[PDB]
Amino acid sequence: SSALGKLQDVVNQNAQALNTLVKQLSSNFGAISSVLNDILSRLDPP
Amino acid sequence: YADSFVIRGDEVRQIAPGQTGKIADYNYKLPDDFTGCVIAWNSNNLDSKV
Amino acid sequence: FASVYAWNRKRISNCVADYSVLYNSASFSTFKCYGVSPTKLNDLCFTNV
């Protein structure tokens, strides 16, 4: 009432990984943008 | 298949996959995964007349 | 026109730009577009040209 770090640790590790997964949807990896509606708007299909 | 026609001299660069211009836009369009070959030769003496 | 070593610089601004009258004028010997293919110009908006 005044120690559950194992449980806390587990509950956390998973959130830190799920956030890193979503934060990768905003990297270019060597492209002009991160949005498909921006490559499909200033580039021809080829 | 063999397709045949006559164009200007500097319009031969629009007969290729993925180009634009008055010829490739609406006269003769080549798909984007073409497979064949394109052959072209000058014919000034046959087709041009005073 | 202007020299090649002191080119000009016009800052087109808030307006209604119709790149189709350009694209289809057939009077241009060279019309290359790099960031964006030409036909999709009359469907986008920027801050300054």
UniProtKB/Swiss-Prot annotation, chain C:
Changing residue 27 to P: In strain: Omicron/BA.1, Omicron/BA.2, Omicron/BA.2.12.1, Omicron/BA.2.75, Omicron/BA.4, Omicron/BA.5, Omicron/BQ.1.1, Omicron/XBB.1.5, Omicron/EG.5.1. Changing residue 22 to I: In strain: Omicron/XBB.1.5, Omicron/EG.5.1. Attaches the virion to the cell membrane by interacting with host receptor, initiating the infection. The major receptor is host ACE2. When S2/S2' has been cleaved, binding to the receptor triggers direct fusion at the cell membrane. When S2/S2' has not been cleaved, binding to the receptor results in internalization of the virus by endocytosis using host TFRC and GRM2 and leading to fusion of the virion membrane with the host endosomal membrane. Alternatively, may use NRP1/NRP2 and integrin as entry receptors. Binds to host ACE2. RBD also interacts with the N-linked glycan on 'Asn-90' of ACE2. Cleavage of S generates a polybasic C-terminal sequence on S1 that binds to host Neuropilin-1 (NRP1) and Neuropilin-2 (NRP2) receptors. Interacts with host integrin alpha-5/beta-1 (ITGA5:ITGB1) and with ACE2 in complex with integrin alpha-5/beta-1 (ITGA5:ITGB1). May interact via cytoplasmic c-terminus with M protein. May interact (via N-terminus) with host bilirubin and biliverdin, thereby preventing antibody binding to the SARS-CoV-2 spike NTD via an allosteric mechanism. This is Spike protein S1. The lineage of its organism: Viruses, Riboviria, Orthornavirae, Pisuviricota, Pisoniviricetes. The chain holds residues 347 to 395 of 1273 of the full protein.
